[PDB]
Design an enzyme around this catalytic site. Structure first.
Site, PDB file in Angstrom:
ATOM      1  N   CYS A 100      -3.572   0.732   6.912  1.00  0.00           N
ATOM      2  CA  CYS A 100      -3.672  -0.151   8.070  1.00  0.00           C
ATOM      3  C   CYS A 100      -4.329   0.483   9.282  1.00  0.00           C
ATOM      4  O   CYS A 100      -5.059  -0.181  10.008  1.00  0.00           O
ATOM      5  CB  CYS A 100      -2.283  -0.638   8.468  1.00  0.00           C
ATOM      6  N   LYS A 143      -1.591  -5.899  21.155  1.00  0.00           N
ATOM      7  CA  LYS A 143      -2.243  -7.177  20.893  1.00  0.00           C
ATOM      8  C   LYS A 143      -1.754  -7.818  19.586  1.00  0.00           C
ATOM      9  O   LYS A 143      -0.566  -7.959  19.353  1.00  0.00           O
ATOM     10  CB  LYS A 143      -3.763  -6.993  20.836  1.00  0.00           C
ATOM     11  N   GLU A 148     -10.631  -7.145   9.047  1.00  0.00           N
ATOM     12  CA  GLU A 148      -9.995  -6.102   8.275  1.00  0.00           C
ATOM     13  C   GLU A 148     -10.284  -6.295   6.790  1.00  0.00           C
ATOM     14  O   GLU A 148     -10.006  -7.353   6.228  1.00  0.00           O
ATOM     15  CB  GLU A 148      -8.492  -6.102   8.513  1.00  0.00           C
ATOM     16  N   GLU A 163       4.596  -4.683  12.056  1.00  0.00           N
ATOM     17  CA  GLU A 163       3.500  -3.732  11.910  1.00  0.00           C
ATOM     18  C   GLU A 163       2.414  -4.445  11.114  1.00  0.00           C
ATOM     19  O   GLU A 163       2.581  -4.703   9.910  1.00  0.00           O
ATOM     20  CB  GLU A 163       3.956  -2.489  11.142  1.00  0.00           C
ATOM     21  N   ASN A 178       0.796  -1.225   0.000  1.00  0.00           N
ATOM     22  CA  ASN A 178       0.000   0.000   0.000  1.00  0.00           C
ATOM     23  C   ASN A 178       0.839   1.292   0.000  1.00  0.00           C
ATOM     24  O   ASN A 178       0.464   2.281  -0.627  1.00  0.00           O
ATOM     25  CB  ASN A 178      -1.027  -0.011   1.131  1.00  0.00           C
ATOM     26  N   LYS A 199      12.989  -6.718   0.992  1.00  0.00           N
ATOM     27  CA  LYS A 199      12.115  -7.387   0.032  1.00  0.00           C
ATOM     28  C   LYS A 199      10.772  -6.688  -0.119  1.00  0.00           C
ATOM     29  O   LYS A 199       9.913  -6.788   0.760  1.00  0.00           O
ATOM     30  CB  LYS A 199      11.856  -8.842   0.407  1.00  0.00           C
ATOM     31  N   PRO A 200      10.571  -6.007  -1.257  1.00  0.00           N
ATOM     32  CA  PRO A 200       9.296  -5.332  -1.503  1.00  0.00           C
ATOM     33  C   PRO A 200       8.208  -6.371  -1.752  1.00  0.00           C
ATOM     34  O   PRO A 200       8.510  -7.549  -1.996  1.00  0.00           O
ATOM     35  CB  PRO A 200       9.549  -4.553  -2.804  1.00  0.00           C
ATOM     36  N   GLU A 234       7.800   1.634  15.102  1.00  0.00           N
ATOM     37  CA  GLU A 234       8.586   2.326  14.089  1.00  0.00           C
ATOM     38  C   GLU A 234       8.516   3.829  14.356  1.00  0.00           C
ATOM     39  O   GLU A 234       7.547   4.308  14.945  1.00  0.00           O
ATOM     40  CB  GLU A 234       8.074   1.982  12.682  1.00  0.00           C
ATOM     41  N   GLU A 267       5.786  -8.438  -3.876  1.00  0.00           N
ATOM     42  CA  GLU A 267       5.790  -8.903  -5.249  1.00  0.00           C
ATOM     43  C   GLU A 267       4.815  -8.052  -6.050  1.00  0.00           C
ATOM     44  O   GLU A 267       4.976  -7.855  -7.250  1.00  0.00           O
ATOM     45  CB  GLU A 267       5.385 -10.374  -5.302  1.00  0.00           C
ATOM     46  N   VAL A 268       3.807  -7.532  -5.363  1.00  0.00           N
ATOM     47  CA  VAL A 268       2.835  -6.653  -5.986  1.00  0.00           C
ATOM     48  C   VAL A 268       3.426  -5.286  -6.344  1.00  0.00           C
ATOM     49  O   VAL A 268       3.095  -4.734  -7.363  1.00  0.00           O
ATOM     50  CB  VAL A 268       1.589  -6.473  -5.096  1.00  0.00           C
TER      51      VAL A 268
HETATM   52  N1  LIG Z   1       0.525   0.219   5.128  1.00  0.00           N
HETATM   53  C1  LIG Z   1       0.084   0.186   6.421  1.00  0.00           C
HETATM   54  O1  LIG Z   1      -0.403   1.166   6.976  1.00  0.00           O
HETATM   55  C2  LIG Z   1       0.029  -1.178   7.100  1.00  0.00           C
HETATM   56  C3  LIG Z   1      -0.433  -2.306   6.176  1.00  0.00           C
HETATM   57  N2  LIG Z   1      -0.641  -3.523   6.928  1.00  0.00           N
HETATM   58  C4  LIG Z   1      -1.075  -4.665   6.292  1.00  0.00           C
HETATM   59  O2  LIG Z   1      -0.608  -5.422   5.192  1.00  0.00           O
HETATM   60  C5  LIG Z   1      -1.686  -6.114   4.477  1.00  0.00           C
HETATM   61  C6  LIG Z   1      -1.727  -6.257   2.974  1.00  0.00           C
HETATM   62  O3  LIG Z   1      -0.817  -7.259   2.521  1.00  0.00           O
HETATM   63  P1  LIG Z   1      -1.344  -8.735   2.135  1.00  0.00           P
HETATM   64  O4  LIG Z   1      -1.916  -8.694   0.738  1.00  0.00           O
HETATM   65  O5  LIG Z   1      -2.154  -9.285   3.285  1.00  0.00           O
HETATM   66  O6  LIG Z   1       0.036  -9.557   2.033  1.00  0.00           O
HETATM   67  P2  LIG Z   1       0.783 -10.159   3.327  1.00  0.00           P
HETATM   68  O7  LIG Z   1       0.371  -9.398   4.557  1.00  0.00           O
HETATM   69  O8  LIG Z   1       0.604 -11.658   3.274  1.00  0.00           O
HETATM   70  O9  LIG Z   1       2.327  -9.868   2.968  1.00  0.00           O
HETATM   71  C7  LIG Z   1       3.113  -8.797   3.494  1.00  0.00           C
HETATM   72  C8  LIG Z   1       4.536  -9.029   2.990  1.00  0.00           C
HETATM   73  O10 LIG Z   1       5.045 -10.259   3.519  1.00  0.00           O
HETATM   74  C9  LIG Z   1       5.434 -11.129   2.449  1.00  0.00           C
HETATM   75  N3  LIG Z   1       5.165 -12.532   2.835  1.00  0.00           N
HETATM   76  C10 LIG Z   1       4.041 -13.211   2.575  1.00  0.00           C
HETATM   77  N4  LIG Z   1       4.156 -14.463   3.076  1.00  0.00           N
HETATM   78  C11 LIG Z   1       5.371 -14.557   3.646  1.00  0.00           C
HETATM   79  C12 LIG Z   1       6.025 -15.580   4.299  1.00  0.00           C
HETATM   80  N5  LIG Z   1       5.398 -16.766   4.450  1.00  0.00           N
HETATM   81  N6  LIG Z   1       7.277 -15.380   4.776  1.00  0.00           N
HETATM   82  C13 LIG Z   1       7.881 -14.192   4.615  1.00  0.00           C
HETATM   83  N7  LIG Z   1       7.262 -13.184   3.982  1.00  0.00           N
HETATM   84  C14 LIG Z   1       6.006 -13.340   3.492  1.00  0.00           C
HETATM   85  C15 LIG Z   1       4.624 -10.670   1.254  1.00  0.00           C
HETATM   86  O11 LIG Z   1       5.303 -10.942   0.042  1.00  0.00           O
HETATM   87  P3  LIG Z   1       4.481 -11.099  -1.336  1.00  0.00           P
HETATM   88  O12 LIG Z   1       3.146 -10.417  -1.121  1.00  0.00           O
HETATM   89  O13 LIG Z   1       5.373 -10.371  -2.300  1.00  0.00           O
HETATM   90  O14 LIG Z   1       4.426 -12.600  -1.512  1.00  0.00           O
HETATM   91  C16 LIG Z   1       4.564  -9.181   1.477  1.00  0.00           C
HETATM   92  O15 LIG Z   1       5.775  -8.617   0.960  1.00  0.00           O
HETATM   93  C17 LIG Z   1      -2.972  -5.770   5.355  1.00  0.00           C
HETATM   94  O16 LIG Z   1      -3.133  -6.795   6.324  1.00  0.00           O
HETATM   95  C18 LIG Z   1      -2.588  -4.457   6.032  1.00  0.00           C
HETATM   96  O17 LIG Z   1      -3.325  -4.342   7.279  1.00  0.00           O
HETATM   97  C19 LIG Z   1       0.328  -3.834   7.887  1.00  0.00           C
HETATM   98  C20 LIG Z   1       1.316  -2.991   8.256  1.00  0.00           C
HETATM   99  C21 LIG Z   1       1.383  -1.543   7.748  1.00  0.00           C
HETATM  100  K   LIG Z   2       1.455  -8.342  20.774  1.00  0.00           K
HETATM  101  K   LIG Z   3       1.558  -3.074  -9.320  1.00  0.00           K
END
Ligand SMILES: NC(=O)C1=CN([C@@H]2O[C@H](COP(=O)(O)OP(=O)(O)OC[C@H]3O[C@@H](n4cnc5c(N)ncnc54)[C@H](OP(=O)(O)O)[C@@H]3O)[C@@H](O)[C@H]2O)C=CC1
Ligand SMILES: [K+]
Ligand SMILES: [K+]
Ligand SMILES: [K+]
Ligand SMILES: [K+]
Ligand SMILES: [K+]
Ligand SMILES: [K+]
Ligand SMILES: [K+]
Ligand SMILES: [K+]
Lengths: 489, 489, 489, 489
Positions: free
Chosen positions: A285, A456, A386, A251, A152, A175-176, A463, A178-179
């Site tokens: 988030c 929780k 969520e 986070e 996001n 690691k960014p 951060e 993949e999206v």
């Molecule tokens: N921006 C903000 O204000 C906040 C955003 N949120 C949350 O992030 C979310 C959106 O992301 P979502 O689509 O759920 O994707 P995920 O939450 O599953 O993934 C987050 C990151 O972790 C990586 N990842 C996924 N699986 C693993 C694994 N098994 N081991 C190590 N790394 C892994 C993903 O890589 P890839 O997707 O490339 O496979 C991605 O880069 C929501 O839950 C949102 O609440 C959380 C924190 C900050």
């Molecule tokens: K906790």
């Molecule tokens: K994109």
């Protein structure tokens, strides 16, 4: 593809991956393939770590001020290239140029600029035990750390994680998602141009299931900083822990409550509620996705929210007048639409939106309308889970304690806020809310000075703020014995 | 059995477990059964959690100084009952009365006393953003936490964990090792006597095969503090992570290096080495079990070590003249002898001991002779692996950089020490040693003011010092907006 | 006299002064002679300094926890003797028992208790410069310091000054006000009984002109901490400066503003205003003696103040039901009556009081009725000048900015407070008020944790809180060079 | 004159003074007039204060990061113009170009750069009292402050004083020594160019007797920071105190001890001794002017010092190869020559120099040869009194404790240093030395991170580091009452 194939970034330069595999990143506004991107292999991870190891030694060997000057130079480059990074971020996320130009890089660089200035201030303690002995502590770098980013706010997150890590003298492998891989690579370039030693900030692209996991498991990495869903966060933390007892920062998600008290200005309350729900098309988030309104103000509040939502300008993210873009991806759009259906099925009253926007060119993109549900119940799926999309749930309450108990009644605990003019109620209420990020009469602002993270299951660690910089060092205590040593033997 | 059946301690009193099971605790000096001890059931863990939740509210609603006075009262009682408690600890651990009377409760109480004084000093921050807005942070209690103790210093560890936790306004559920359950129950009685509210310190008896796991997994427990082996730690932290994203502190194992530089007083160096290896019969996590001596000095140092070791007074822990007791348990003795066998088998030169002591009454206890190996090499099992018994490995080196490189070549990183009279070398070397606890010209002293814990796989987080107190709170940031609020919509 | 002759307290016991002179201390309630008190000579000062120098060495050689325990023991004795000490303070000051039993010793001891707990937390810093050099700081005791007290809260002030001083490892020579010497001597006895080494808290009685000045001029005293009038503070600070450049703390007078905004509950506002003017018979430095009320609320506010003032129980301080006693002395009464006259002469409207009370037994003592003037103007003597008696000035304002501008229009800057229910106004206003001690919706509370002191001509430095402890140490920076030294020569 | 007439700097530009008077500043290398310089009048002081009051409001109203960026820009300009500013400082002070090019501006800018980075980190505290009440502190700017400079390091002192002052959000009026006014005016230009608001840094030229005193007396100035001689410091501090109770910082003189222990490398020892006596031609406040050498090493140490002093390159400060210039002024040289005569007269043995250098062109400048006295005694005038010229006094001692006792036997206490290779001795000795600035095996380095200032009569407060930033703010405590208020009335 709009761009050439994206490579890995290791050692102050792009290098070929050794996976023989790629993935595509897709502009969510139109379905366009933006670029193919290489997948880091297991050995590429090994490579990044070794590079990170040697780079960190060079970085840590400099003086505090030298590191500070280099980070400040990076801040300068980020300011210059703000509009260009924003345009890239807009292609890659779908977020409106109006947001990316004013928020993503600006606040990303704000945090870096903050930490760059604090490098010289990282200090240990000194404690006298007695005339013949004292102790001093050192705050040493952890060494090599890893950041796993979310989609996001791709560049902002890369900055918020890498700034304190580098400021504390560490090397980071990032690691960014993949999206959204594009802007992270650009950040690596900028660091290198600013004078950051090769290896100190490397970028590995690929999936979380693979390269993400390979990073969390690697015995030479000392800490993981993760941003994503709570479900994924748990897997990541366990992996980081059971592999080599890495330090962690998580986070994660939330379902944050916003309580409007009966003395609130309803214009301000509506402005807050819509900002807390519809900025970045509801992909924040910390969003106030459960909006508590007192019975006596429900009709006037709904009318005022309605009026603001109607005038939301959904459109092409490239158009400067757009302030609400598509979602980040078609699969994510599908997710959101499912939740929206859930709300309809569970009999929540639909006030606004509630479906895909397909008119004309919009059908080619992942557009969901700003959606408001009212007459919600605490046990509805849209209220418990969520959604991470543009979906506001309005919940009526009758008294303060009820509002607070309900706000707290969730396994999440990232953010919370209250709207009120009464001095005692504002503070009283916020003190009772179980969230790490609490706003009074505002929402969404996240100053570089303010530690942010979840209670929780919404997170571990924090951060930003001085405390975050401290947690990118490890403590060594040194006891100096100046007198005799006694042995019982 | 010597004593009555030991019950669970929940809500300011003993209550009956609901498992239908007991286990024995044994005096390792003579194999005598000290007591049957009830095992908590899963429903008993739940009962202790609910009790803790209610107790914590009472505790946290007191003023800081009220908590402080109550903890100070517990310190007074501990000072009064020092000898009585030391005797009980000696029965349970086999540690000599000379140790338990002057170390265990003394230094346990030292830390409680230290934290008691600091309750009123737990502060948050205030940060001005602009004229119309500022933020302040609160350091709020985590709520309910769990401590899991080790068997080498049962009451001291219970104190080191519970003191910061309670000082910071949390309740703690504590599980002593099944190998040494007795003194923790006494500590619980004492807290209650001092005025600690019911539920604030509960004690659950059992093992890591059950109650331990039930604690790390419980959804309502916010933090785990664990002391034990690295391998167990990895399991604990993984369960703590994946279950509900708990915060964790881990004090784990070590293979800590003691480097004796050529300019060192060999009498002091010998003294430090014996203390770093044979206090509490080698059952100290921070023990200096790899002793580096320069080749020019190997002959001389081995003789001084030999002379001290020879005059070690192994014997019945009840005798005040004993300064070296049996091991904590017979199974632990078997483990240690195994390692000693490994040493012989891998051709290290046995200088001292190397066997079980079985003469006369000793045959009924778990006695292992003070053992010294020399001519060791880095690839020997006794050199890579933690033995946690009376086994010193002496390693020859040639130059300073080599010694340090080898000292660092381990996945461990708990402690490290150097012996040298040179100002420059002392600090230069200590700064390059990758350990969280560093001693110059001494060993083993661990003041309440000094943060202690491990680098790498030797730990996560710290115990003691100011920093540890902070880590028993969570940060809430509050942003107060006093001016206008701007919406883009 | 009621008591035997009071001697100097030096080196852990009472010693005869060498001046050949004494003065009397008088009970203000009835003019009774409480005691003859010895005047310290110049040589007695020299004797007390040498005593302090030696005692300080013993005190500083102890460990942190040893000092902490002795101070805690002093707290325990103070709690035991609260009532007996209150009785003595009432005789000496005229303040009601109802105040002395619950405030003076309670809050004096609160501060000693706070600092006792913090002794082990006094730490320096450690700063790495480069691989071959680092610095650490020590916070060392100043050495011998002097406290000069005031007559309104004699023992409380003695405690608020000696607690941080002793906690930081200093020796203090304390000179109580000639007007109220009795409780300071009891404190010195209590310190000794608690185990404070001889010489560490010495008490010299006499006048400020002589012994006070001899203290401020003495070349071996490293710090002066003074509480009294602004005019006197200027002299004392000049003297401490020009003699030997001493460190200083000054707690001085004020004319603190209380602003009642139009949305205030007028009952709470009236309670606050009367507490802020009539506690200790108006003899409190932080009193809110200029009370701003909005024009629209003036009449209602006056009625509420009047109602509370009418029921104030002026009476014999020995009677538990008394809540308003005589002033500290006949000369101070004359001064206060002079100001009251000024107020009448300058045409402020007399709402309440405004005269000496001589009825019955009151003619024997120095009793001034609680007095309220309204319709005041900024240029009136009673509004500009600290009266230090029971005289409230009510001032009418029309708008918020006006009220704040006028509240700030003074050379004083000790305290300030606002009464309002509005969140934004409460913080906005307080942030703009130029005083060190600011209250929102309350008045007069001064927690041990809260640094208190004046802006502008109301003070220098602070008392209480963490910061103050730090200001009773001096920073030594130590640079350790571990590498080569280079010379340009 | 070489330069045009220098005017006052008020409001971000030069303005005509209103005294009608000027003074001359003289190149000490040749006696020539560098510039006529205007004398500020009393009304010019008032003008500068009003300018500062308005400037300070603009400055403080900006955000922390805005202030930070402006100061960082000033740093950038100072780096650009390092050589140019160094050349001006050389003209004005007579110090060698080799010094000014690498020290004066370099280390001036270092401190500014350090504080610029810390602006966002200035925080207050938050303290919970109970559920219904909490306090927070604010660290507010003092407002307008005044710095008064010395002549040995004009621009560096102006920077060390102005940097923390501005970083903490104050405006500073600065008065350079009448002896060296030039670089300060340049600094003001640079601040304006960097974006410092008009009025925030004003420069007034003239004598300490007049404008200096007018500044210490002004009722609106909240703090004085002074650098110079102890005797003058006392008068300045007295005046700042009695006028309006200003806060103060005093960096004064000293007679700092250097103790060479018998295990020291005499080559390093000599290098340190000379550097501590002859840099900036002996015009360094922290100079180690009493050098203690053990009797067994006296002869050898003298030889090594003699060899070094003989190769000292005294000459034209404009010559890059010169490393020892003339003194700052002819009257100052005369004073130094007096002290040297006293030395000869009191029978100290002259080892080196000991007269004015008049050969060739040197007779037109104020040149004193590097001078070493040995066989000195503690009662000699040259040993007791600060000379602030190139005069080293060598003193023989027989034992460690004697040497330390003699080092501390002085009313001064600015700096101290030991030379030794022994771990224990190094720390043990330095902990017993009564000085604020302590060096082990080095001398003269003063990093921005390290707080520096004097014990005893060598100073009040400190400059640089993290502590100094704090002391350019005033603490305001805010108690928020959220619950009921109780009155006894
Ligand atoms: N921006 C903000 O204000 C906040 C955003 N949120 C949350 O992030 C979310 C959106 O992301 P979502 O689509 O759920 O994707 P995920 O939450 O599953 O993934 C987050 C990151 O972790 C990586 N990842 C996924 N699986 C693993 C694994 N098994 N081991 C190590 N790394 C892994 C993903 O890589 P890839 O997707 O490339 O496979 C991605 O880069 C929501 O839950 C949102 O609440 C959380 C924190 C900050
Ligand atoms: K906790
Ligand atoms: K994109
Ligand atoms: K046992
Ligand atoms: K670790
Ligand atoms: K009296
Ligand atoms: K002041
Ligand atoms: K000059
Ligand atoms: K001083």
């Amino acid at each position: 593809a709009r761009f050439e194939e994206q490579k890995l970034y290791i050692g102050g330069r792009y290098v070929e991956a050794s996976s023989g595999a790629t993935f595509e990143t897709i502009n969510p506004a139109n379905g366009e393939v933006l670029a193919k991107v290489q997948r880091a292999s297991r050995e590429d991870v090994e490579r990044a770590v070794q590079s990170a190891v040697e780079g960190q030694k060079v970085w840590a060997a400099m003086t505090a001020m030298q590191r500070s000057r280099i980070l400040r130079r990076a801040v300068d480059i980020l300011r210059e290239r703000n509009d260009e990074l924003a345009a890239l971020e807009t292609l890659d996320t779908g977020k409106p140029l109006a947001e990316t130009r004013s928020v993503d890089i600006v606040t990303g660089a704000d945090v870096l600029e903050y930490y760059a200035g604090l490098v010289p201030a990282i200090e240990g303690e000194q404690i006298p035990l007695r005339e013949t002995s004292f102790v001093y502590t050192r705050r040493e770098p952890l060494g090599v750390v890893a950041g796993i980013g979310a989609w996001n706010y791709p560049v902002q997150i890369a900055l918020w994680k890498s700034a304190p890590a580098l400021a504390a003298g560490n090397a980071m492998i990032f690691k960014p998602s993949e999206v959204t891989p594009l802007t992270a690579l650009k950040l690596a370039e900028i660091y290198t141009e600013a004078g950051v030693p090769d290896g100190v900030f490397n970028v590995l692209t690929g999936s979380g299931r693979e390269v993400g996991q390979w990073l969390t498991e690697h015995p030479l990495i000392e800490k993981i900083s993760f941003t994503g869903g709570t479900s994924t966060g748990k897997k990541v933390m366990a992996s980081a822990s059971s592999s080599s007892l890495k330090e962690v920062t998580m986070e994660l998600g939330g379902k944050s409550p916003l309580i409007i008290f009966p003395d609130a200005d309803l214009d301000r309350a509506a402005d807050i509620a819509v900002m807390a729900n519809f900025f970045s098309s509801g992909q924040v988030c910390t969003n106030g996705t459960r909006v508590f309104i007192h019975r006596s103000q429900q009709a006037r509040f709904e009318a005022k929210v309605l009026e603001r939502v109607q005038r939301i300008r959904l459109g092409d993210p490239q158009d400067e007048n757009t302030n609400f873009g598509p979602l980040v991806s078609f699969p994510h759009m599908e997710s959101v639409l499912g939740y929206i259906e859930s709300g309809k099925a569970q009999k929540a009253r639909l006030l606004c939106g509630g479906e895909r926007v397909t008119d004309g060119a919009f059908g080619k993109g992942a557009y969901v309308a700003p959606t408001v549900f009212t007459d919600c119940r605490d046990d509805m799926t849209i209220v418990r889970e969520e959604i991470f999309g543009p979906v506001m749930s309005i919940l009526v309450y009758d008294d303060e304690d009820e509002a607070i108990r309900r706000a707290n009644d969730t396994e999440y605990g990232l953010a919370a806020g209250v709207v009120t003019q009464d001095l005692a109620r504002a503070h009283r209420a916020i003190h009772r809310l179980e969230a790490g990020i609490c706003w009074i009469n505002t929402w969404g602002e996240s100053p570089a000075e303010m530690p942010v993270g979840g209670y929780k299951q919404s997170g571990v660690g924090r951060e930003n703020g001085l405390t975050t910089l401290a947690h990118y060092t490890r403590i060594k205590s040194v006891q100096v014995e100046l007198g005799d040593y006694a042995s019982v033997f």
